Amino acid sequence: SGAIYVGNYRVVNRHLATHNDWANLVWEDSSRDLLVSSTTAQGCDTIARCDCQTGVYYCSSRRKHYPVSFSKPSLIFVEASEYYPARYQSHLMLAVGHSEPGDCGGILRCQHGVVGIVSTGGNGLVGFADVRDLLWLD
């Protein structure tokens, strides 16, 4: 679990969005595994606007942060799950690291701010849904 709180927006994994997220929907994209809902309280997270390919992510299944080198956002084939059929997930960045299903939502950050959230895992890999291109979040 986990979300990004920026301005009047909450960014979550679309497959973990709650009934309240869908009732306050701003934007969603199944191909990116992202959903953004509106909030009444002001969020104070900062979104990075950069081309970093290194950062640190939070892994809830280890209660630890890990440094990672990750690929640029791209279209990656993701196997079928209970949430989606087999498909290409866009704007996805991969790194070598630990990620179990409940780790989705963990933030990846660089020195500029929030880069994205954990969205995929298994096999000693961790995949992050990029949010740096969503300029409207600010």
Ligand SMILES: C[C@H](C(=O)N1CCC[C@H](C(N)=O)C1)c1ccn[nH]1
């Ligand atoms: C194995 C699982 C996973 O990659 N998916 C299931 C949950 C939905 C994911 C998606 N983005 O399509 C894919 C996962 C998450 C985090 N660590 N391991």
Ligand SMILES: [Zn+2]
């Ligand atoms: Zn950066």
